Amino acid sequence: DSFVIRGDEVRQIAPGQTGKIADYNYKLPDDFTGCVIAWNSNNLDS
C-alpha cells in the first residue's frame, strides 16, 4: 500500500490509533502486518 502523507501524521499509521487519518483516511486491522516503511520526499515532492 503506497501513499504520501504529512510527516507529523506518521504516528497515526499503527494499530490501536485514533485521529483524522485513522478514522477517515487509513485504518489498520488489529492483526499482523508485514512492515511499515517510509522515507522523506522533499527532493521529489515539495
Partner: protein, 49 residues
C-alpha cells in the same frame, strides 16, 4: 438442633453458592470489575487486556 447433620449440608451448599456469586465484583487487578464500563470507556487494545 437435633438435625445438625442435615443443616450443615444445606449451609455449606448455600455458602459455596454465595461466595461464588460474590466473586463477580472482584477486580483481579483490572481497572474495573464491570465489563460494560471498561469496554465503554477504553480503546480495544487496553480494553481487551
Amino acid at each position: 438442633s437435633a438435625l445438625g447433620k442435615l443443616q450443615d449440608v444445606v449451609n455449606q451448599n448455600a455458602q459455596a453458592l454465595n461466595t461464588l456469586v460474590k466473586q463477580l465484583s472482584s477486580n483481579f487487578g483490572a481497572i474495573s470489575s464491570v465489563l460494560n464500563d471498561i469496554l465503554s470507556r477504553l480503546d480495544p487494545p487496553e480494553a481487551e487486556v
